[PDB]
Each structure stands twice: as structure tokens, then as C-alpha cells.
Amino acid sequence: QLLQPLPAEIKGTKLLAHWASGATITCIPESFLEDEQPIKKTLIKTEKQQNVYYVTFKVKGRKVEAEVIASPYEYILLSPTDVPWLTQQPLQLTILVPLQEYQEKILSKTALPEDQKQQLKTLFVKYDNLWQHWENQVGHRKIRPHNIATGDYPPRPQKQYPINPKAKPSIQIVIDDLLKQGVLTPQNSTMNTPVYPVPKPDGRWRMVLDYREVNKTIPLTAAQNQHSAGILATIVRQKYKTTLDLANGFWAHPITPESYWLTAFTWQGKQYSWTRLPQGFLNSPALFTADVVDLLKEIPNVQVYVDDIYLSHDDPKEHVQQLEKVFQILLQAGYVVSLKKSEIGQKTVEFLGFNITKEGRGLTDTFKTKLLNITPPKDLKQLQSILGLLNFARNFIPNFAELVQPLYNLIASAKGKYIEWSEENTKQLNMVIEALNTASNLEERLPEQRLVIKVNTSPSAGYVRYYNETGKKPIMYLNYVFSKAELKFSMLEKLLTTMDKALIKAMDLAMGQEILVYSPIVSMTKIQKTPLPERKALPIRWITWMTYLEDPRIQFHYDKTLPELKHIPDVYTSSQKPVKHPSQYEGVFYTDGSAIKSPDPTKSNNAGMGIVHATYKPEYQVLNQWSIPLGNHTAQMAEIAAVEFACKKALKIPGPVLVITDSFYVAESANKELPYWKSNGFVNNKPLKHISKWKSIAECLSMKPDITIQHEKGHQPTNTSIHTEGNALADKLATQGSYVVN
Ligand SMILES: [Ca+2]
């Protein structure tokens, strides 16, 4: 539990003891007492009567004799009374996590009224014991331990090859912390399981076990938790959502002693074994998620997957009241919550098990139908790929042959490898896509036919078509918006990610029917065999991906007709059309620029920018201002140069920010041609200083995209809104900055 464990021998063999608190006597695990003859017998209520003994054992090598009782558990529950010389100390592991930053970040990113927010701040110190305070700190379920030596045919010990030593240091800490708490034991065994390293985002390495041999030895004879698609249709959607990360909760369940060998692995020649459920093993995920779902069966609105728990309510009092019941259940069960990834009391939870943030209030989530604009090719190979991509539409889009003539009129005309795109060609590409998005080329879902899904993927996005089985038009397309990490996946993994995404929206359209999936992969047998140096996706991904092959209402098929897409340009997303309120953010950055005639004939011009940091929380308040003289530059470059400054000053703000511009050019260009200018390389602008001014709002939005940019005219504006006050302030500053001369 949460006292330092204590290392001991009884009869030759070593074992762990946990300091006790009750007035009960010292329980020994039941298999040591078997040969010992009983002293008296005595009825324990919490009235099962039991034999009592008097035995000798060691604690830190020193000998103890004690009046003891039998325990079905794996450890010694040690009475403080029996050991008056030793004192109880708390658990000491290697690296103390920054629980304070974690808690501050969660109190920050919260939609709770500061009233309940303050009640959460008291809850963080109410069951502080149920929070992960140390790295590698595991919990301890006091449950009946599991037996995974099922199936009589043993697996065959896999040899352990050498691995990267540059990872051994950060992995040894883990090994030593999981020994100290008894999660590993040093037990030479008949099985050897292979081990590999994978890099962690922080620059350390985390260890992976390749259990694919053991797993074919044991059967999935167990009531599996509902799968991703089962959970995502059932979930309640109400105002306040919350997700909690069990820190490797499967490590909390123990396994029987006769099972330790099965889990064995070698690390620096010494062959260790697991006291607890291992990650990789066939039945871990379902046994742990089973127990979780039992523990929260009384809670109205809860969904669990792997170790991620999501709970949501409408009434902010009832949310935190239910959440305390959960904290109690998890504490008394021995579980351990990690607040680094956890998200409490938020109107949008960044992920509820799968890769999809939750928002608003319906029982089912609801995603954007239409796909996004592709950017222009930079190459012949990039043009041929998109051609071969659109080729399927000839048969159901009447205005295709014409639309596409100009693009082909681009293959042979500039027959010199690289071609040339006019700006009107990009307008024709957008016209192409809009056709496919018009409701006359979209079929309707037919409950008699089966539901067909055609899946491919570029490097930038996944491409998904939905058809009816015999249909000639697609019900709806669906493009995929890869997360920052999803981008790091290999190709085939991009295809499988996209499959999970597509099947979540699909679980709505099938409406009691079957689903057929067509893809460029020849088998769903050969792919489980893909070697682990190639899997660039966490095996949580590969698991969630392969849970779908146990569903009878889903079949996978190889479509030879599909085009090779490893040469599609970038998709052009947009933070545009979601223009939102003026005041609901966490900060507002007004911007302006002026330029006037120059006093020295040589410079010819003279510009100044202006910037305002205001927050519109309870009411308008100004946090800082700025009036910066720029030199001889375009007035439009003052208005441009001001938003770069306020974007850079925003990276310091963990939250949503708003940036206001007088300049239609900047405010539109930062919405319509910026995603384009990026995938162009700033070619044929403008000498060099001009180009080195646009790139930096690019890079600054890349790093933080939760920053929006609006526009306004603002001429002769008396009080045209509540919003123009700030932009008059900012126009005063940029004009002030203009008049000053160096
Ligand atoms: Ca102006």
C-alpha cells in the first residue's frame, strides 16, 4: 500500500511484508503454515473460526517470533506490536513527480465555477493518497489473485538479444522501483520473454515486452469489456466531462505464485518475473477493465477503456459529488491516479480513451462530414497521385471530364518533370472538391444494402469514402485530421488509425446492419505479424486496432483498384469558419499599424506598430501595452508586424487567445493563403526581410494553434461594438509609435 514494504525471509525463501495498523495479529500466507501445528483456534468475524500458530521468520534478517494467522494473500500483514524495534516509514521511490504543477494545470484548465473549483482544490488534499506521487508508483488491489497459467501446453523460451544500452539507465530506475515495491521478483524460469526499448516523448526510454508467444498459449476465455465502438455509442454527453488516467492499473492486480514464471524476462542476464498483470499479456486489459467497470457500476455516467475513465454530468454540484464517490471507491480499491494527463471538470476532454475530443451534449459524438482541400502539388509525381486518386469519380460526377481537362493539360504541356500551377488551377481544384460535397452527388444510406467503407491514407490525412454496397455515389466522404503524434506513425499504421476513426462514425450509419471495409492491405493475418522495429505506434494503438477483428458484423477486404497515395500533398485545414465569441477566451491581443511621410528624404517612409494585452474575464481590463517604432516600412507591414509580436507573447499563455487586425490582408491572408504559403516555401514573393516576417506567424501557430485571428475595419467608429474600444487603444499606440523617429 502506501508504507515502505519490508523484506524478509521465513523458510529459505524471501517474501515481502507490509506494516499493519489493525489490532489483528500477523497474517502469514497460507502455504507456509501448512506443516505447522496449531496452538488454539479462534473465531474471526471480519465468525469464521481459524487456527493460530507461533512461528519464527526474519525481517531485515533479524529474527521475529510471533502469534500468527493464515492469509490467502501473497504478503505478510505484519502487526506493529510484533515488531516494537522497527518503526513505520512511508514509501520512498526514486523520482518524485511534480504533483503541484500537475494539480495547478488541472485547476487551470477547468470549466468549473470558482466555487466548485475551490471544492476541487480541497478534494486534491482529501484523498491525496489516491494520487501518483512518485514515478513508477503502482497501487495494490486487495483482491483474490489471478491465475494465468491456463491451458496445459507451455510456451517455448524466446532468446533475448542485446538492446540499445543508451536506454538502460532510464529503464533501470523502473526495474529498481518495481522491485522495491515487489512488482518484480528475481525468479529463474522455464519461459523467457523478449524485451525492447521505445523512446518516450521526454527523451527517456520506456520498456516493452514482446509476449506474442505466451499469448497463443492462453485462451481469451473471459467476459471482455465492451470494445471501443461499443463504448463510444453508449457514452453520456453532458456539460462537464472528466477523464482520469489510472497509472498502469493492471500492475495493481496480482497474479498467483505459480504464475510468476510465465511472465519471466531477462534484463542484464538476471531473469526476473512479475508479481502482477503485465502489459502485453493476452488477458491483462480485459481483467483490469472488468474490475474497474464493477467498481463503478453504481455511478450513473461512467465509461472505461484500458485505464482511461470518463465521467460526465450536467449539474456542477452532482459532478463533483459523484467524483468524490469515485475517489473513495478507487482509494479503497488500491488504485492510483496520475494527474499529468488527467482532466477534471472540463467542457471538452482532450481524449476519452480513443483519439476524439468530446464536446457539447448528445449521447453520440458528431464529426465533420466533408473532407478538406488538398494543397497544390509541387511535382509531377504529386500531380499523378492526385489524378489516380480522383479517377474513381468519372462514373457518377457528370461534370468531371471538363473539370479535369485543365489538370491533364498540365501533365504534357510542361512535360519537363516539374510543371506550373496558376492560382486559377487551385480554384479549379476547390471546385472539384465542392462538387463531391454537393448533396446531388451524395447517395443516402439504404438499410437493405450493406455499408461499404473504402479506406486509404496520404502522409498528411486519412481518406475515407462511405458507399452503399452496390451504390455509385458516396453517401459521404470523411477526411482525417491527424494529431501531432499520429503524424509520427508509419504508413500502415496511418491506415489502421484511419480505420478506427472511420468505424466510429460508421457505427451510426450501419443502423443494425453489417459493415464491409476495403483497403490496400492484402490480409489482416499478415499484419499481426508485422515486426516490432516497425511499429511506431504504442501497442495500445495496435491493440485497440485489433479488437475489431473479433466483431462478427465487420469484414475486411483487399481492394486492388486502389491508388498508391504516398505522394499526396498536404491537406489544408482551417481555424476559420469557427469564428467564436469575443470574450470567452483567456486573452485578447489588439494590434494596429501606422505609417507616415518621412522627414529625412532618404528613408521616404516611417512606420510604427501598436499592441495591447487585455483580458475580458469579469470585465475589460488591460494587462500590458506596447508601442514600437518600426523604421521605414509599409503601413501594412506595421499591421503585419504587430500580430507576430502578440502571437509570440501568447505562447506564454496556456489557453485560448484572440488577435484583432485592422488589415483585411493580414487577417484574411492568415486564413486563406497562409496554409497555402507554407506548403509553397515562400517562392516568388519580398526581397528577404518581407519573407522573414510571415514564416514566423507560421511557426508560431504550428507550436500553438489554439490562437485565433479576427479582423475589423474601424473607421469613424463611435461605439460600433463592445470590441472596438480595444482597437482604438491599439490604433492610438501604433500611431504614437509611428510619429517617433530614431
Ligand atoms: Ca491604421
Author numbering: 7 to 52, 56 to 694, 697 to 753
Copy out sentences from the published article reporting this entry, exactly as the authors wrote them.
A cleavage between the N-terminus of integrase (IN) and the C-terminus of the RNase H domain of RT produces mature IN and PR-RT from the Pol polyprotein. The mature PR-RT has all of the enzymatic functions of PR and RT [reviewed in]. The PR-RTs of FVs are monomeric in solution and the RT component is responsible for converting the (+) FV ssRNA genome into dsDNA for integration into the host chromosome. The arrangement of the subdomains of PFV RT is similar to that of the p51 subunit of HIV-1 RT while the PR structurally resembles a single subunit of the catalytically active HIV-1 PR dimer.
